Amino acid sequence: KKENRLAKQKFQPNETILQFLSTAWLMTPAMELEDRKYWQEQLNKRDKKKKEGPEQLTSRNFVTLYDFPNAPPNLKDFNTNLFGDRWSYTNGLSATQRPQDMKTV
Amino acid sequence: KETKEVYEGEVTELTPEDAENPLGGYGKTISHVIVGLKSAKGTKTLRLDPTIYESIQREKVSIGDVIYIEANTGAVKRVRSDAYATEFDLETEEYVPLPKGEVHKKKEIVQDVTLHDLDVANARPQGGQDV
Amino acid sequence: KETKEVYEGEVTELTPEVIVGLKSAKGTKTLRLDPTIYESIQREKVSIGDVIYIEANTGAVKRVGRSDAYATEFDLETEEYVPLPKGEVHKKKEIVQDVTLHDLDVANARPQGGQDVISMMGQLLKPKKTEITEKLRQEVNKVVAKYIDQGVAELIPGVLFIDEVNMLDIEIFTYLNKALESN
Amino acid sequence: IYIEANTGAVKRVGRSDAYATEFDLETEEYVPLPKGEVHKKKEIVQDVTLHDLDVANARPQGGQDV
Amino acid sequence: RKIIDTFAVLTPSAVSLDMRKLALGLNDDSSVGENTRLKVMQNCFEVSNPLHQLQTKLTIAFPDKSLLQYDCGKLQKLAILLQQLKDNGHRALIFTQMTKVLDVLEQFLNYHGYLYMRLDGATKIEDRQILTERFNTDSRITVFIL
Amino acid sequence: VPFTAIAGSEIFSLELSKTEALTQAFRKSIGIKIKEETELIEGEVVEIQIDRSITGGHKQGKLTIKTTDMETIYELGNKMIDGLTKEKVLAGDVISIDKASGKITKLGRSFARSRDYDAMGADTRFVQCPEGELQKRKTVVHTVSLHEIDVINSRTQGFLALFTGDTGEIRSEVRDQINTKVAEWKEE
Amino acid sequence: VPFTAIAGSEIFSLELSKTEALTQAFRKSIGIKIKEETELIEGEVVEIQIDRSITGGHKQGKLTIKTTDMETIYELGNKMIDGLTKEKVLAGDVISIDKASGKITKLGRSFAFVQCPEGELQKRKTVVHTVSLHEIDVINSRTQGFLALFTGDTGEIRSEVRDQINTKVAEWKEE
Amino acid sequence: VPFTAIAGSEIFSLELSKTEALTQAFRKSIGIKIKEETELIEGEVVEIQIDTGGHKQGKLTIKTTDMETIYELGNKMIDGLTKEKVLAGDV
Amino acid sequence: KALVEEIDKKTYNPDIYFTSLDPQARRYTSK
């Protein structure tokens, strides 16, 4: 009998699949932690060489939600940033026209 | 007069520096990005904020052609190299010899301009499809 | 006594080919935009949650702003919150906006539709005063005669003033000498 | 049609009278059927001074955009 | 934008219709060539214009209405109690013996912006028992006119 | 016989030179009347049917134009549908149509000679009914000055400069070709 | 208070008549000042988290613009993401934004050099805007007159607009 | 050596004041020479034939009078040959 | 035409315009 007796809209976006949950965070809780991260800024400078105002601002990364076709999808599209696709066609046989679907009869 | 830092060389590599996603969601979170460069007699790898990935995404850096990025302002800028120039018989591609000097350098510019030049730049409307 | 009407309401949909579904307090009607006024509507960044004060006779569109109904979008929303206008969207009023003879001269010599893009080109190609000739004078005389014979309108004279005619040259004196010999 | 082969464009005589009368009314002119053999050839002689050429060259004659 | 927004109130007096399309060359009938009209209206669709606001703000500026309670004489000493009871969590009842007071308290409530409802002639047919239980049940309301 | 009664003081202008002004006055003083054998289709068009563009017949558009004299139907050739409703009008409008115009002029409402249905009706019908024949040639006479012809020659659109008044000092070969054209038109 | 000066050879003009040049010279001196209310949010962005899909068309955000007094994670609506992410926004930077416009004003970087602010985040104030008579005449008379504010591409403004602005000023002063 | 053919009654022009009109006459009176160098390919009777889109194995036959070979291409030409859409039976 | 004239997106199909004084009260053929 409650349903018989008893008888504005909002805006909300969504994000999923390929996502860069962006944050430019000075990840400094509280003071010394950046020093440890200052090490991960450090062991990739002198080794690879071919033979309170710390740093100059940072940023971060994330994915929402659990979307990874092959590696980071950001890295997946960055693998297309190497040498394009048309020259890949020229050096190949247009493998994008060879599908793994449509099982052979 | 002004002087801007310049980081030169050729992009030897581009790799993620992954950390586990700390905030809402899990998976990939690049801590930062370190990319090597080598001009004539000067080799150095730049550690930089991970955000430069967008520049790599935006500028279509490919690998080891042109680098223009600063410590604070950041972002790469592109303008290949003559080493690959013979790979194509004919194209419409650009090429350049190896950059000289060290990876980090500075440039000094002096320019004397009249105030009337600024006035006419303000006055004269320049643009495109805007009416 | 000419007539003006205004469409004012919350937009519900837009259909490119044009529909603008203005929703007032009690009315929700969908006009058709001509391509020019459709472009003007496009430039007005009007979307679901917006009210526009688009006149009916002139046709020009003046957005009123984001609807106050969607006040729950951001505690610090930039756009002003204006509610759904009262009455029907096609609000009609009886206006006593009069016209001087030069006013209706410039009305057709240099049209001033205003807010639409084509009205912008119309007021930009010839923004100044053009040398109206006697042919348009007779056309205007016929138009004002038919309007005043429509019945509601009327005519009232006026007084002009000149100071220190001593400085005036002989040319203007000679021309006005034959100009006062008129009706 | 009336297509001068020198440019490959079209000059329109109008519609035709054979496939005409598809309707009781037509604002577009029915236009008389062209007379003579299709591969028409002719020569024209015109006496024109130079200032007309100058003023024609001064201003544009075609264009499609604004 | 702040230098272009407020003052845009002037309205040119007289306009005659069908004098701009007859000048641009786009229409259903013109002496100029008809090969451009479609592409010209597409340009009008997506040709950028920097004078958008000043073009579209020349019309009326839509003024606003004051005067709900600024000079209300006997009503000045009513907020000094209702607001204090609102802060202290004490509800109150407003009783009326006049129609011209019942039709005026509504704009006071609209101006002062407190959740309110009335036991008067200002509801609908299906908001009588529900409103009775609304008053009976505790809520955030502070104004009930009777 | 239009005249030119203007004092010589205002010959000076900031848009037309003295020579241009005098030439304009002289060419305005001499006029030409033109008779054009335009056509018409008059009669009460009780209905306007617009059928689809069928392949066999590209337009089966029915429209029943009939005057007081006769009852008749017609057909639209896929060009005149918007000619009726360039401005939004309904059927039953007397149409002073012109073949070489494309701009059908509606004169309002019109009458049939029928009593319609049996019950009480026939309300709201008091307008002008077509009187003349269904079709008759009209040798319409128009009077224009050399100003209109010259401004038409100078620019593709000429009504704008005729109304606003910014002709723009048209050149001489225009006047020469108009002289020849008017001479041969009088001869023809 | 405005005050305008001219010389003995600037009376003449080509885009203007000497009549209209002297008219504008007379008009420019007088001015009006209209007051208005202003609101502002101020603090230091010390946290930020934006949900943004790559190559997408839907996003949300949470910027924690805060002072040294309390923790406050503010929100962005539909278009505010671009407005608050047009330039660099980090997690230490002292930032002040306006509500009705979302404009960004760089009070200064925290370091790498201003300390984190105290007080309350949202402050209100009043701002009075000044404008001369001729400027009011020219801004609202036509559409391209905004270019005339600098290029001066106008001459002999229609007197109807002048009378309308004069009566507008008169009734503004009256009320 | 262009010769400045200007009479006395040609300097009192409307849009050109006499001083800068004389300056323009002198500017015309000067003589100068300029040289430049460019490069081209002549005789490219191409007859493209490749084995759809994508330009897989993007090399074009080129057949002029002297050398008749096949030119290899790249990202800019394998999509530049589809630019200027031709039947490839021409120079 | 009359620029930006009164129109409520009522039909306005360039090849559809049916009106009458209602002596039969019908419309154009279709299915």
Q: Any idea which residue has 């660099």 for tokens?
A: G88
F103 interfacial to chain D (CB closer than 8 Å): no
Contact between I6 and C113 using a beta-carbon 8 Å cutoff? no
> What does the buried/exposed string (b/e) look like for C6-23 if buried means 16 or more CB atoms within 10 Å of the residue's CB?
bbbbbbeebeeebbbbbb
Residue type, B67: I
CB contact under 8 A, B123 and G49: no
Please report, in angstroms and rounded to a whole number, the separation of the first and last CA atoms in chain G.
Answer: 22
Tokens of A103: 């099982």
> Angle of helix C134-149 relative to helix C101-109, nearest 10 degrees?
120
Strand partners, G123: G40
Query: How many angstroms separate the CA atoms of G76 and G59, rounded?
Result: 10
**Which residue of chain A has the CA closest to G62?**
A23
CB contact under 8 A, G143 and E54: yes
Interface-testing mutation among A89, A91, A97, with chain H (most H C-beta atoms within 10 A): A89
Residue C44 near chain E (CB below 8 Å): yes
Q: Could you tell me where the beta strands, DSSP code E, fall in H2-91?
A: 59-63, 68-72
Contact of E41 with C35, CB cutoff 8 Å:
yes
In the three-class reduction of DSSP (H, G, I as helix; E, B as strand; rest coil), residue B119 is classed as helix
Determine phi and psi for G52, rounding to 5 degrees. Answer: -140, 120
User: What is the token pair recorded at E22?
Assistant: 């007859």
Closest chain A C-alpha to G118 CA, distance in angstroms: 19
Q: List C-alpha distances in Å: H79 to B78, H84, H91.
A: 22, 10, 20
Six-digit token string for G54: 């790559």
Please state at what angle helix G133-141 crosses helix G18-29, rounded to 10 degrees.
120
Burial E51-81 (b: 16+ CB within 10 A, else e): bbbbbbbbbebeeeeeebbeeeeeeeeeeee
CB C134 within 8 A of CB G151: no
All residues of chain B having their beta carbon less than 8 Å from the beta carbon of residue A51 are 43
Nearest Cα neighbor of G38 from G119, G83, G99, G94 is: G99
Encoded tokens for G94 = 């002292």
**Which one, of E14, I13, A103, lies nearest residue C102 by Cα?**
E14
CA A50/CA I9 separation, integer angstroms: 71
- φ/ψ region of A21 (left if φ > 0, alpha if ψ in -120 to 50, else beta) reads beta
**Can you tell me the distance from the alpha carbon of I3 to that of C37, in angstroms, rounded to the nearest whole number?**
9
Q: What's the CA gap between B48 and B25, in Å, rounded?
A: 24
CA dihedral B23, B25, B27, B31 (to 10 degrees): -20
Structure tokens at E20: 């701009």
Burial of G137 (0-12, 13-18, 19+ CB in 10 A): buried
Q: Of H57, H58, H75, which is closest to A84 when you measure between CB atoms? A: H75
CB F134 within 8 A of CB D24: no
- Do F159 and F8 contact (CB within 8 A), yes or no? no
Q: CA-to-CA distance for A89 and A85, rounded, in angstroms?
A: 6
- The crossing angle, in degrees rounded to 10, of helices C35-43 and C117-125 is 100
Out of G52, G88, G90, the one facing A21 most closely (by C-beta) is: G52
**Cα C102 from chain centroid (whole Å):** 16
Chain E 20-39, residues with CB within 8 Å of chain I CB atoms: 20-22, 27-29
**Helical H segments across E1-146, by residue range:** 21-24, 37-45, 52-56, 76-87, 99-102, 105-112, 129-136
Residue C150 CA from chain centroid, whole number = 22
Question: Tokens 């208005």, residue?
Answer: G36
SS3 E107: helix
Find out whether the peptide bond into A26 is cis, omega within 30 degrees of 0: no
Distance from CA of E19 to the nearest CA of I (A): 8
Burial of G106 (0-12, 13-18, 19+ CB in 10 A): exposed
Interface A–C counts its CB contacts (< 8 A) at: 10
Name the token pair of F56.
Answer: 């066999």
What gap in Å lies between CA H27 and CA C175, rounded to an integer?
Answer: 49
CB atoms within 10 A of CB C66: 23
C-alpha distance from I8 to closest chain E C-alpha (Å): 18
**Residues sharing a CB contact under 8 Å with residue G149, sequence separation 6 or more, in sequence order:** G135, G138, G139
CB-based contacts of G93, cutoff 8 Å, min separation 6: G44, G45, G109, G110
C-alpha atoms less than 13 angstroms from C-alpha of E107 in its C-beta half-sphere: 12
Residues in chain G: 175
Q: How far apart are CA F58 and CA F52, in angstroms?
A: 8
Tell me which H or E stretch contains F33. Answer: strand F31-38
Beta carbons within 10 angstroms of residue A74's beta carbon = 21
Structure tokens at C157: 């004279």
Inter-chain CB proximity G111 and A53 less than 8 Å: yes
Q: Check if C37 contacts I (Cβ < 8 Å).
A: yes
Contacts of H among chains (3+ CB pairs under 8 A): A, B
User: Does I have 3 or more CB contacts under 8 Å with F?
Assistant: yes
DSSP lists the bridge partners of residue F147 as none
Token reading at H82? 């589809």
This PDB structure is determined at a resolution in Å of 4.4
Q: Name the percent of chain H in helix, strand, coil, to the closest 5.
A: 20, 10, 65
| In contact, F94 and F128? CB cutoff 8 Å | yes
| Contact across the interface for A93 and H56, Cβ inside 8 Å | yes
Residue F164 burial by Cβ neighbours in a 10 Å radius (0-12, 13-18, 19+)? buried
Chain D interface disruption, residue of F99, F154, F171, F174, most D CBs within 10 A: F99
Chain H residues whose CB is inside 8 A of the A87 CB are 74-75, 78
CA angle (C167 as vertex; C164, C171 as ends), nearest 5: 120
Q: How many CB atoms lie within 10 A of CB F144?
A: 13
The set of residues, in sequence order, having a beta carbon less than 8 Å from that of H52 and lying 6+ positions away, is A94, A97
I8/C37 CB distance under 8 A: no
Q: Determine the Cα–Cα distance for residues C79 and C75; give it in Å rounded to an integer.
A: 11
Residues across chain A: 105
Chain E residues with CB-CB distance to F157 below 8 A: 22, 25, 30-32
- Pair of tokens at residue D20: 């005409």
Residue F125 domain boundaries: 35-140
| Pairwise CA distance, residues A96 & A84, whole Å | 13
Q: Do B14 and A44 contact (CB within 8 A), yes or no?
A: no
Q: To probe the interface with A, which of G46, G47, G54 has the most A CB atoms within 10 Å?
A: G54
E42, E142, E139: which is closest to E85 by C-alpha? E142
Measured between CB atoms, which of G47, G50, G55 is closest to A21?
G50
- What is the helix (H) or strand (E) element at residue G52, kind and residue range? strand G31-52
Helices F172-187 & F146-154 angle (0-180, nearest 10): 120
- For the record, the structure tokens of E73 come out as 């004489």
Euclidean distance between CA atoms B49 and A55, whole angstroms: 10
Does F53 touch chain I if contact means CB atoms closer than 8 Å?
Answer: yes
Which residue in the set B23, B24, B122 is minimally distant from G150, CB to CB? B122
Q: Please indicate whether, in this complex, the C-beta atoms of B23 and A23 are within 8 angstroms of each other.
A: yes
- Specify whether the CB–CB gap between C108 and E16 falls below 8 A: yes
DSSP structural state of residue B83: G
A touches which chains (3+ CB pairs under 8 A)?
Answer: B, C, G, H
Q: Which chains pack against G, by 3+ Cβ pairs within 8 A? A: A, B, C, E
**Using the beta-carbon criterion (under 8 Å), do E58 and G101 form an inter-chain contact?**
no
* Residue F113: partners with Cβ closer than 8 Å, 6 or more residues away: F68, F71
Per the DSSP assignment, residues forming a β-bridge with B109 are B2
Q: How far is E8 from chain F (nearest CA, A)?
A: 28
Beta bridge partners of B4: B107
Cα B130 to Cα B114, C102, E43, distances in angstroms: 28, 33, 11
3-state secondary structure of F123: coil
The rounded Cα G133 to chain-centroid distance in angstroms is 19
Q: C117 and chain I: CB distance < 8 Å anywhere?
A: no
> How far, in Å, CA of A92 to CA of A87, rounded?
8
Q: How much is the CA Rg of chain H, to the nearest whole Å?
A: 27
Q: How far is A33 from chain B (nearest CA, A)?
A: 14
> Which chain G residue has the Cα nearest residue A24?
G90
Residues 24-53 of H with CB under 8 A from B: 41
* Chain position carrying tokens 């205004």: C6
Region for C163 from its dihedrals, namely left if φ exceeds 0, alpha if ψ lies in -120 to 50, beta otherwise? beta
G125 forms bridges with which residues in the sheet? G38
Q: Which of G172, G110, G134 is nearest to G31 (CA)?
A: G134
What is the rounded CA–CA span in Å between residue G62 and residue G73?
A: 6
Say which experimental method was used: cryo-EM
Indicate which of E1, E2, E4, E10 best probes the interface with G, i.e. most G CBs within 10 Å of its own CB. Answer: E10
Strands C50-55 and C61-67: antiparallel
> Letter for the amino acid at H73?
L
Q: How far is C72 from chain F (nearest CA, A)?
A: 43
- How far is residue F21's CA from residue F167's CA, in Å, rounded to a whole number? 11
Identify the burial level of H31 via C-beta atoms within 10 angstroms of its C-beta, where 0-12 means exposed, 13-18 middle and 19 or more buried. Answer: exposed
b (16+ CB within 10 A) / e for C146-162: eeeeeeeeeeeeeeeee
Spatial strand order of the sheet with F74-76 comes to: F44-48, F61-66, F74-76
Q: Are strands B33-39 and B42-48 parallel, antiparallel or unpaired?
A: antiparallel
Instruction: Report the residue count for chain B.
Output: 131
Here the CATH number for the domain that contains residue F69 is 2.40.50.360
Which residues have a Cβ under 8 Å from the Cβ of G126 and sit 6 or more positions away?
Answer: G35, G36, G37, G38
Q: Select from C29, C34, C36 the Cβ nearest to the Cβ of I8.
A: C29
F73 to chain I, any CB pair closer than 8 A? The answer is: no
Q: With CA atoms as reference, report the closest residue to B31 among B48, B50, B13, B52.
A: B50
